[PDB]
Amino acid sequence: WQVITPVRRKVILAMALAGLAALTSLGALLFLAWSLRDIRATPDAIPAWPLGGVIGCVVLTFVLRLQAFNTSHYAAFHLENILRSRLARKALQLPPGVLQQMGSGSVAKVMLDDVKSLHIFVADSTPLYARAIIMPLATIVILFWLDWRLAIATLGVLAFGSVVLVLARQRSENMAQRYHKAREQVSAAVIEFVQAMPVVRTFDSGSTSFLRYQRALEEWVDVLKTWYRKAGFSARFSFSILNPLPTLFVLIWSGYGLLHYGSFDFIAWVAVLLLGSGMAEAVMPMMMLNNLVAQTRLSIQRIYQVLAMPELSLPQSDQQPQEASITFEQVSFHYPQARTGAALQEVSFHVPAGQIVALVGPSGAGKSTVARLLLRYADPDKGHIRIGGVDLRDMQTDTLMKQLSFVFQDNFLFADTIANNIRLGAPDTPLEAVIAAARVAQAHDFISALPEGYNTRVGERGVFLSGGQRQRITIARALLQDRPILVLDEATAFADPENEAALIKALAAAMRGRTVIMVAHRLSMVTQADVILLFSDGQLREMGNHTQLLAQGGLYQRLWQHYQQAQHWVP
Amino acid sequence: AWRVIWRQLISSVGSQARMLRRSMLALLLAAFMQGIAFACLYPIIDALLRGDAPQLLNWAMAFSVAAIVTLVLRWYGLGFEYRGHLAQATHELRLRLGEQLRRVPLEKLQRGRAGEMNALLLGSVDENLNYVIAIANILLLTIVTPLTASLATLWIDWRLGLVMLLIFPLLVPFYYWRRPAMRRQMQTLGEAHQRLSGDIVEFAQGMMVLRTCGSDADKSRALLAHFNALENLQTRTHRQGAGATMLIASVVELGLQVVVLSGIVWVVTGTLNLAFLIAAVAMIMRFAEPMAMFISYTSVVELIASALQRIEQFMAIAPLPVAEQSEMPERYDIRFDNVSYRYEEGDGHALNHVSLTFPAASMSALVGASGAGKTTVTKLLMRYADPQQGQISIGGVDIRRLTPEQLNSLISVVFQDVWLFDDTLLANIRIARPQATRQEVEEAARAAQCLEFISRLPQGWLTPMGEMGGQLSGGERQRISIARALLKNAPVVILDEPTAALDIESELAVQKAIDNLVHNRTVIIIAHRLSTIAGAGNILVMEEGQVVEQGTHAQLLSHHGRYQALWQA
Numbered sequence A: 001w002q003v004i005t006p007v008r009r010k011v012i013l014a015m016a017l018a019g020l021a022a023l024t025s026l027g028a029l030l031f032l033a034w035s036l037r038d039i040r041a042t043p044d045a046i047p048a049w050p051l052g053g054v055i056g057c058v059v060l061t062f063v064l065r066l067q068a069f070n071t072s073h074y075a076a077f078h079l080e081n082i083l084r085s086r087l088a089r090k091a092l093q094l095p096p097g098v099l100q101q102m103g104s105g106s107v108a109k110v111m112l113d114d115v116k117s118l119h120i121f122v123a124d125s126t127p128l129y130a131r132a133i134i135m136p137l138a139t140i141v142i143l144f145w146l147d148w149r150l151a152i153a154t155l156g157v158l159a160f161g162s163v164v165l166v167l168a169r170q171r172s173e174n175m176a177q178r179y180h181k182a183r184e185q186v187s188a189a190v191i192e193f194v195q196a197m198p199v200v201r202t203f204d205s206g207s208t209s210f211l212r213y214q215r216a217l218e219e220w221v222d223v224l225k226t227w228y229r230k231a232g233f234s235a236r237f238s239f240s241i242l243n244p245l246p247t248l249f250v251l252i253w254s255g256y257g258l259l260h261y262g263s264f265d266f267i268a269w270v271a272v273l274l275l276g277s278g279m280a281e282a283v284m285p286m287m288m289l290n291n292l293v294a295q296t297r298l299s300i301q302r303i304y305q306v307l308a309m310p311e312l313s314l315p316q317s318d319q320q321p322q323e324a325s326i327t328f329e330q331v332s333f334h335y336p337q338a339r340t341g342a343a344l345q346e347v348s349f350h351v352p353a354g355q356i357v358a359l360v361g362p363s364g365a366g367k368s369t370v371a372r373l374l375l376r377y378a379d380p381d382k383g384h385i386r387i388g389g390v391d392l393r394d395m396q397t398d399t400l401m402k403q404l405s406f407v408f409q410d411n412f413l414f415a416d417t418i419a420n421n422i423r424l425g426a427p428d429t430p431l432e433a434v435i436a437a438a439r440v441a442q443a444h445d446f447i448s449a450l451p452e453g454y455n456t457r458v459g460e461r462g463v464f465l466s467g468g469q470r471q472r473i474t475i476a477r478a479l480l481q482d483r484p485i486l487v488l489d490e491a492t493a494f495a496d497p498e499n500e501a502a503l504i505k506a507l508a509a510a511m512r513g514r515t516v517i518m519v520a521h522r523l524s525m526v527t528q529a530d531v532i533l534l535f536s537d538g539q540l541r542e543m544g545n546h547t548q549l550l551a552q553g554g555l556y557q558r559l560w561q562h563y564q565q566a567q568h569w570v571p
Numbered sequence B: 001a002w003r004v005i006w007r008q009l010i011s012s013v014g015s016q017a018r019m020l021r022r023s024m025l026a027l028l029l030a031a032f033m034q035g036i037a038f039a040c041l042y043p044i045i046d047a048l049l050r051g052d053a054p055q056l057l058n059w060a061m062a063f064s065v066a067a068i069v070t071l072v073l074r075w076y077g078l079g080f081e082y083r084g085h086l087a088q089a090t091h092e093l094r095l096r097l098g099e100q101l102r103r104v105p106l107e108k109l110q111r112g113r114a115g116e117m118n119a120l121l122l123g124s125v126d127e128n129l130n131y132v133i134a135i136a137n138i139l140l141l142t143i144v145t146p147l148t149a150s151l152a153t154l155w156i157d158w159r160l161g162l163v164m165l166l167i168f169p170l171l172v173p174f175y176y177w178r179r180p181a182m183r184r185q186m187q188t189l190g191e192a193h194q195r196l197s198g199d200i201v202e203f204a205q206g207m208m209v210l211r212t213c214g215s216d217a218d219k220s221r222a223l224l225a226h227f228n229a230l231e232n233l234q235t236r237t238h239r240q241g242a243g244a245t246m247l248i249a250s251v252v253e254l255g256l257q258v259v260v261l262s263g264i265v266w267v268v269t270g271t272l273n274l275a276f277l278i279a280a281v282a283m284i285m286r287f288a289e290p291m292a293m294f295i296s297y298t299s300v301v302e303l304i305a306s307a308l309q310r311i312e313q314f315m316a317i318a319p320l321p322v323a324e325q326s327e328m329p330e331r332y333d334i335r336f337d338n339v340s341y342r343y344e345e346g347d348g349h350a351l352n353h354v355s356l357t358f359p360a361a362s363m364s365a366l367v368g369a370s371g372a373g374k375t376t377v378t379k380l381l382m383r384y385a386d387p388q389q390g391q392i393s394i395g396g397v398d399i400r401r402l403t404p405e406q407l408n409s410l411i412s413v414v415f416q417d418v419w420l421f422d423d424t425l426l427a428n429i430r431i432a433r434p435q436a437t438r439q440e441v442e443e444a445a446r447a448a449q450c451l452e453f454i455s456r457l458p459q460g461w462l463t464p465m466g467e468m469g470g471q472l473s474g475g476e477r478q479r480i481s482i483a484r485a486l487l488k489n490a491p492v493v494i495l496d497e498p499t500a501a502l503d504i505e506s507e508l509a510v511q512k513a514i515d516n517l518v519h520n521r522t523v524i525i526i527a528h529r530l531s532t533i534a535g536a537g538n539i540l541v542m543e544e545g546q547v548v549e550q551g552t553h554a555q556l557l558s559h560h561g562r563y564q565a566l567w568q569a
Ligand SMILES: CC(C)(C1=N[C@@](C)(C(=O)O)CS1)[C@H](O)[C@@H]1CS[C@H]([C@H]2CSC(c3ccccc3O)=N2)N1
Pocket: A165, A168, A172, A179, A227, A231, A232, A234, A235, A236, A238, A239, A287, A288, A291, B130, B131, B134
């Protein structure tokens, strides 16, 4: 609706200013009719007062429409800033799973294009909509006061164009939605085709994907062509009868029919001429208005979706921080129906201080959900996860982020180039501490070999950082913060050989003296651990050390036999 | 310029050049005859303030004749668009863009990093060319109709004619005279708007690391200060650019006032132009609606100009030179002779000065310390780009003598696939050979071991996979791609690093599938893991864009990064 306007004191003002501007423009045309009557009655004396009225109402109309646009644009900018502020304060408290999903193509796209389309609605269109209300609702009264017989013709032609355009809009009531459906489907086909071009180039001629794109294109073409036919055989008539020329054609012959059998007054005719002129260009932004307000209603419904979407992670700060333990208590969590991560039926396991815990999983989702859920991506349904004795559901979000220090696969880096990108935890950078934290295995040589030193720009527009060195940077950060529980996902994630040796030395420095829950896939780091847990399809199956599980005869000796065989290429 | 827009518009419409030229002529004659009807409005009013019913009849009949003619002509000029001839125009434009995207060298397609989304965005935004008749109707009306009405009132009067001619039909050049100031200020606004979009992207992605560093509140305050700085720049720009915007929007009334004052000055003095002032005011009041339409459509004019410029720039790049295209070899001994290819000019000689030999019916390996380097040669073998110096050859025949078709069906590449495009998986296997039946798809799926997992998967080989293509592990995705390259019996197979996903399912199934595929085949494995490379028969080490020691495994054991590379495993 109009519910997203808390700036309505400064939009109702711009609305009334544009309405009075249109009303004084009508007053200017009426004073022009007055001055022409005075110059026809006595055509030797220059008309002085009502021509001064003409130029006064013109400069008043210009000043009022200027202040109308200034108030409307300041109101639009204030609405845009307050709406992006409420979006940022809401997206701070989104659970990071759904926010990471919308971080691909949605929440930045909505936080830009929603408020930009809201600016093009409430800035450059609502004074026009006020003018389109006010002018043909006062010009009918002026036309009826000026002539009983002559306003009927120009009113009949404008109502004729109105009923023809509304009849043309009513026949396209579903076909516009079908056109938008065809456009979104064919733009999806264009998306998959341009993403498809390299692989379908190297796998065949491209003929299958080109046919799969050409068929959706021809479907959109047939939809657009039948819409143009079925709407256009009336829409050409609507566009050609809203021209000033049929209004002139009825007006000239109505003047002739009034002159033919008497009772015709020239001044009342030229008043109807100028006001009947002034109606149509005011009423044309009402022809564009539904076209604009459809997309505006789509954008406002999108922002009401984003402003009220999540469960907001249930923030609870009503507890104290304890230390160094980690306990799963019969927890159960499944993702939303469109998400990654299969499930976790029932897991319970308790790890004291100073044990390195390896989670080994064949799934990639049974062993990732535990680390993501420990980092409070979401909340488990039925169960309790406790760092120390205290539940993390009631954990102060400062204290919880003081406890856990995490690394992952994708590992985003900011434009704070390095010395504030490593030291991002503290607001200030004690620089020599960042030197010592980058003195671990291979941060220092990769930074020192860079052309611009420790301020070599990484950012959005800098160096690629070769993938693995981003992981080395955040390893230096996680070793700088020295929070007691460190959460891994990258134990030899990227198989570059010197990067593998360097990351293993750096992780041997970083895991030392911390309750580390490490999610690996290559078991070379898993075989040196304390309590190894196996995760198949969201259920905990194994427990115990490396040797005890291998002697147990369970899933783990089979998954170990699989690995040592698959290291050798030939069988 | 304004003639280059017409040339690019008459070319990129396509085979409707005759209908577009006919409709441009229809709209020009329609605007011109409407202006002549507006001139015929003059002696109507001159007869009308007197009695003169015969004069009013003898000119209103001509007004009806010159009104019906231009209304019919505007009806045909828009009947270019509303019979449907623009749908065929943009359809032919998009089907020419499709064949040009299928014919483009992949080098420009990939090295255009912004050019990727640029080509995708233009191919999706080419429905913005729908405005071309509703903009050639408004612009042409606003320039021609006041010009012909004014060139007729030069014959009715002298001075009202010059005041009308200098002001009203030159209004569209008086807008494009003041346009580049608005384009510069809109550039200043759009640059900060794009910087804000980049900062929002950075916030939304790095939310998680921003929260675990504990500084989420600080970057929230930084984003709120950035929002207030953007609103203050928007207000400071709009406050100093609203005068020109309001003058341009009300220039038709502020030009009407000049005619009203000057005409009254002429009426009261002895040069009694009688009611031609009233008719001229009633004429140039009705130039308000097309000018108000044109100032609404000018942003679409700029988008149409940029789209046509980008289209004529995009369809000007040509495929690779193909000299003596009739050959196709049968002696698949891939040979490279002094190849030096410049990926980007910032880091020249990316694949510098190589000389390779991949002998037939064997496996030859590439190894290196970078993602590129040893994958740029596997790009060059697919005719990604012409080598800047040197020759590349499948046997005795150079690659430049082959078609893109014979080369793109001669070899088969396997990499980390992000595809299958949300449909049946029988077609996703059979897309490498549409001339392959149902009995060979199951043969390839049995020889590439995706068969047990796809029988475990539901829907029984119908299998729409409509949940964005991915609901399964990447390891069986790799088995699908291996079966796809196995179906097309290509005598040269390029392998990427095909083993990076899991331990049991991905690694064992993909190893079982790949060790089937290498049999009497020239294959190029470029995986970094020196065990699978150590099993091979010919070793090429790519060290900073140049090979250094080509030989067998013992030649790698001669002098290398030997002990570290074998110790890290
Ligand atoms: C792109 C286009 C030029 C637009 N049209 C606008 C003016 C509209 O709001 O229509 C908004 S962008 C097309 O016309 C599209 C095609 S689908 C719809 C058709 C259905 S019938 C009709 C119409 C009828 C009477 C007068 C003018 C018209 O355009 N338009 N609009």
